[PDB]
Design a protein around this nucleic acid. Structure first.
Ligand SMILES: CON(C)Cc1ccc(O)c2c1C[C@H]1C[C@H]3[C@H](N(C)C)C(O)=C(C(N)=O)C(=O)[C@@]3(O)C(O)=C1C2=O
Ligand SMILES: [Mg+2]
Ligand SMILES: [Mg+2]
Ligand SMILES: [Mg+2]
Ligand SMILES: [Mg+2]
Ligand SMILES: [Mg+2]
Ligand SMILES: [Mg+2]
Ligand SMILES: [Mg+2]
Ligand SMILES: [Mg+2]
Ligand SMILES: [Mg+2]
Ligand SMILES: [Zn+2]
Lengths: 60, 98, 122, 84, 155, 206
RNA sequence: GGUUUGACAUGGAUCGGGAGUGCUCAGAGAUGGGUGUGCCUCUUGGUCGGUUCACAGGUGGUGCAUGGCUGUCGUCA
RNA sequence: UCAGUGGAGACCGCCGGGGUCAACUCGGAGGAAGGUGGGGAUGACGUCAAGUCAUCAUGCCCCUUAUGUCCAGGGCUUCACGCAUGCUACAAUGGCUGGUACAGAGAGUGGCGAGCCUGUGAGGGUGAGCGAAUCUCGGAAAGCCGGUCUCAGUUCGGAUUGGGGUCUGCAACUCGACCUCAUGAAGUCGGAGUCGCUAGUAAUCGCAGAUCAGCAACGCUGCGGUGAAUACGUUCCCGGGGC
């Protein structure tokens, strides 16, 4: 994402309702999980690389 | 009396930690209820595999939290000091309810 | 000409013959019956004039019905038109007023599909 | 619509401008971007230039406007018809 | 399929009348996965049958099924530049299936109000020898007889 | 294009997670600091050669295992560089960092360092075929049961992109009990960057 | 409608002690003006300021310059 | 019983036939399960200069008091139309109404909220309990049973439109969901053509989660409830495999 957008999201919003999430590794604004920050792609790649404890592929 | 909750992501380290706790308290007398397994928390995440325009192929992940419970029937303040001072693996946490 | 301006259809239960009146729905008819103390499960053709006019009096006293409510609704729409709100402009255009989408269907307001010729590919 | 117990929402600068206009003579056009605000009787008889995205279109507020938002009278999209 | 004849699920018997025929009838009605609704319909129809005639409802259902059972039916064939209607004999299982399907479909098509004794009326009419099901059986047999000249194409 | 990450595929089955901590109200922020730590270490310790960064936490105390081929760069002179990197780590995180640096016994057998070296040679403009053959030969001299290297990109500074690969021995990617070490790096050239992937079949594990 | 080393980085210099903020005013807001509060070491740091100097910034172009990731033929043999 | 750790169990292993034998194959016994038991993960060498410079990264080119950057308002929600994926239907195997059974998998501290009071209701006011196999979401719905409607463009259908509201939010005009009152549109089973499915499947019935202040979610990913018909066969249609 754009650096200005990332810093604006990081800073406290004017009105509480105006805040949003952003991928904390990636800056992506779509599909950001509250449990661990990050995003769709960041989750997939980091879970594959094994930096997320407890997270493994599910094949039930 | 005296609750010990163990939570981790790997049941091997959960079992090893529970065995270490029970063998420690016993080495300090204190007879203690066996490690009873609680249901494992099972969080599921579905993720679009591709970075773009490919929604029908997805990848699923789980974060399984394994929980065990220990009761320290015998008060045994010596075991209290032992259980507060011993060292446990980083992956597993401990919760002591007095 | 049974009720105010509408004839209740014979051989039909009173609780729905009341809903046959404009301005009266299911719950409005049910209230009306409970207020008038009249059963709702008897057919209309067994209706004495005294209870019929009692029901008429209750409806007329409590409820805007038939021509009155129709004129009120038309007046409301005309007032929207003449004030020129967004809803009024949509009303004049004959297009959905409550923020419905108009790209794909909007059909119950746009009428039947008057398909138009478009550009032809090669 | 807005909850009744929260009262009407007037954007708190439109209110002050219309009050100043009332105090110093109800003759001026009040330029605002507050499509967000609620028409109130205290501004009846004023003329307000409501922003519509690219221009402050003027509306002369009458008695019947009161139960509406300022932005209802400043259309934002222009259609004019398909073809010609 | 290519591999071979797939196994058939065994047919259970009706607890009440003790006949696999009624179970097949309810499984053929069996709309929307509502077994209880379907067999309520079927039991109501059979009881109406025993009401209107003293004979056993399972026996009258059997008689209707024999009156609707087709013996041979024609299938499309792609020999040459024109399609043929080759008559083929029908096995007992296939003909019972066809009779049940026709019974249920024409019961659904009947003009009476409720499905239960639409099916009851259709069953009685078929057992007597009348109705849309019997008419369709006769029509299919008639068309098989008309196209009987292609009985030598059987493989 | 359609192959799974071997490490993620075997995660939990044969290989293990690089981070070992438990937290259920801070999970995201600990993940964020871990990302910061890993990015900082990778960006500032390319010269040492990083096999893996392993993070543990006990209570507001972080422990970093740095598996490096040549920890001489990390330790500097008498631990001066180790102290400075630790201090930068407290500056970055705000927590007590205990940093320890470990060797890799067979850098020629660890895939990540193999990709490191191949990408370094490609950046230094060595013929890719010669580099891949050298890495393959060194891996089998060490005693790996199977090598597979693939370099994709504008190989040799060309215009079209190629996907040149080498392999011999056995690399059963589909076998879960198979211990397969996977490494990847990017050679930063004057012509974009080359992706170098390395699979090394260490052996079979239970 | 504002802004121009910039909304955000990193480094040298140079003038510094507050930065940062509470309440108010003007403004659609950005922002600007008030008013209150005002560094910790130390005689040479943390932190900010400008003036610059380097520089940043771009969801601007090319997926036919690429890496990565994915679809797909195809669970096909 | 269940929870969750570690074991056992299925291997054509046994019996008989076929199979020159041999691989296999058929039948049987034992058994929870028999010939791969069901499902998932796993996608070979490569193809399509297939998609992504907009997740990230990056070669070169371009912008630099503007193609940077901040803000308010607007737009991404337009509407003569066309296509596509769905949802609700067209009713009686149904609608309405009272009573009454049986789940699984999940979520929760700015959260899940019981109970009581208040309101027709959305909700409001108080407010325990629970970081949760404990407390809450919670009611499962279909179904069964009683009553009722009686084939009616309807007591089907719930579009649209008028009124009165609630909640979230700085703020619901453009452009939110929901409640209530009224309104009651097309629709009578859908042309040529076309789609899914071989069993706990299709069909249907509800439930939960992600994102999320709220929500246009009927979407998506899961979960269980009820639960079929049919497969003679490879001639034909589509895709593919060996020679
Ligand atoms: C136009 O520039 N010159 C003439 C050649 C060209 C040059 C550079 C490019 O980058 C592409 C192309 C051709 C297009 C054609 C595209 C098209 N598609 C958009 C429908 C298509 O018909 C298919 C297909 N059905 O397979 C493709 O292959 C396609 O997608 C593709 O890859 C393309 C490219 O990007
Ligand atoms: Mg938001
Ligand atoms: Mg391409
Ligand atoms: Mg393109
Ligand atoms: Mg396999
Ligand atoms: Mg292309
Ligand atoms: Mg770019
Ligand atoms: Mg859109
Ligand atoms: Mg929890
Ligand atoms: Mg199949
Ligand atoms: Zn990301």
């Amino acid at each position: 994402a754009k650096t200005a957008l990332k810093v604006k999201a990081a800073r406290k919003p004017k009105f509480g309702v105006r805040a949003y999430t952003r991928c904390q590794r990636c800056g992506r604004p779509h599909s950001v999980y509250r449990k661990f920050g990050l995003c769709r792609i960041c989750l997939r790649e980091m879970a594959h690389a094994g930096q997320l404890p407890g997270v493994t592929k599910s094949s039930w | 009396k005296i609750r010990i909750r163990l939570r981790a992501y790997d049941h091997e380290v959960i079992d090893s930690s529970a065995r270490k706790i029970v063998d420690t308290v016993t080495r300090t007398g204190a007879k203690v209820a066996g490690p009873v397994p609680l249901p494992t928390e099972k969080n599921v995440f579905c993720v679009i595999r591709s970075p773009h325009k490919y929604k029908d192929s997805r990848e699923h992940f789980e974060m399984r939290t394994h929980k065990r419970l220990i009761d320290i029937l015998e008060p045994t303040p010596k075991t209290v000091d032992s259980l507060m001072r011993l060292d446990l693996p980083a992956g597993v946490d401990i919760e002591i309810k007095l | 000409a049974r009720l105010i301006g509408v004839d209740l259809p014979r051989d039909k239960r009173l609780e729905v013959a009341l809903t046959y009146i404009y301005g009266i729905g299911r719950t409005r008819a049910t209230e009306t019956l409970k207020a008038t103390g009249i059963s709702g499960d008897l057919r209309v053709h067994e209706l004495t004039d005294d209870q019929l006019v009692a029901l008429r009096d209750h409806i007329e006293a409590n409820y805007h019905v038939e021509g009155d409510l129709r004129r009120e609704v038309a007046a409301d729409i005309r007032r929207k038109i003449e004030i020129g709100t967004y809803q009024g402009r949509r009303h004049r255009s004959g297009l959905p007023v409550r923020g419905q989408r108009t790209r794909t269907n909007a059909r119950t307001r746009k009428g039947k599909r008057k398909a138009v010729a478009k550009k032809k590919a090669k | 619509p807005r909850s009744l117990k929260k009262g009407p929402f007037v954007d708190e600068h439109l209110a002050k401008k219309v009050t100043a206009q009332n105090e110093a003579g109800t003759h001026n056009v009040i330029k605002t971007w507050s499509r967000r605000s609620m028409v109130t009787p205290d501004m009846i008889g004023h003329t307000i230039g409501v922003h519509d995205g690219r221009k402050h279109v003027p509306v002369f507020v009458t008695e019947s406007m009161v139960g509406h938002k300022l932005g209802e009278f400043a259309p934002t999209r222009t259609f004019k018809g398909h073809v010609k | 399929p290519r591999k071979g004849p797939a196994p058939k699920r065994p047919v259970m018997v009706d607890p009440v009348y003790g006949s696999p025929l009624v179970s097949q009838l309810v499984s053929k009605i069996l709309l929307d996965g509502k077994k209880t609704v379907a067999q309520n319909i079927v039991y109501t129809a059979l009881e109406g049958c025993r009401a209107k005639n003293n004979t056993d409802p399972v026996q009258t259902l059997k008689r209707a099924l024999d009156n609707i059972k087709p013996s041979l039916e024609v299938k499309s064939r792609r020999v040459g530049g024109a399609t043929y209607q080759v008559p083929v004999e029908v096995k007992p299982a296939r003909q019972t299936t066809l009779a049940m399907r026709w019974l249920v479909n024409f019961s659904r098509e009947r003009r009476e109000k409720t499905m239960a004794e639409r099916l009851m009326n259709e069953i009685l009419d078929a057992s007597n020898g009348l109705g849309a099901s019997v008419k369709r059986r006769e029509d299919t047999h008639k068309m098989a007889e008309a196209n009987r000249a292609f009985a030598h194409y059987r493989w | 294009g359609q192959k799974i990450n071997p490490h993620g595929f075997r995660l939990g089955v044969t290989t293990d997670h690089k981070t070992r901590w438990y937290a259920e109200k801070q999970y995201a922020e600990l993940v964020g600091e871990d990302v910061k730590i890993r990015e900082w270490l990778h960006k500032n310790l390319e010269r040492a050669g990083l096999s893996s960064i392993e993070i543990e936490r006990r209570s507001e105390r972080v422990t970093i295992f740095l598996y490096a081929a040549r920890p001489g760069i990390v330790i500097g002179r008498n631990g001066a560089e180790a102290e400075r990197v630790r201090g930068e780590l407290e500056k970055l995180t705000g927590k007590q960092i205990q940093l320890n640096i470990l060797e890799v016994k067979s850098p020629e057998t660890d895939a990540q360092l193999v990709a490191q070296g191949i990408a370094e040679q490609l950046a230094a403009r060595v013929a890719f075929r010669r580099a891949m053959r050298k890495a393959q030969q060194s891996a089998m001299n060490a005693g790996a049961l199977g090598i597979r290297i693939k370099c994709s990109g504008r190989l040799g500074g060309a215009e079209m992109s190629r996907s040149e690969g080498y392999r011999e021995g056995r690399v059963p990617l589909h076998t879960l009990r198979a211990d397969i070490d996977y490494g990847f790096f990017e050679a930063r050239t004057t012509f974009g960057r080359i992706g170098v992937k390395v699979w090394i079949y260490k052996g079979d594990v239970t």
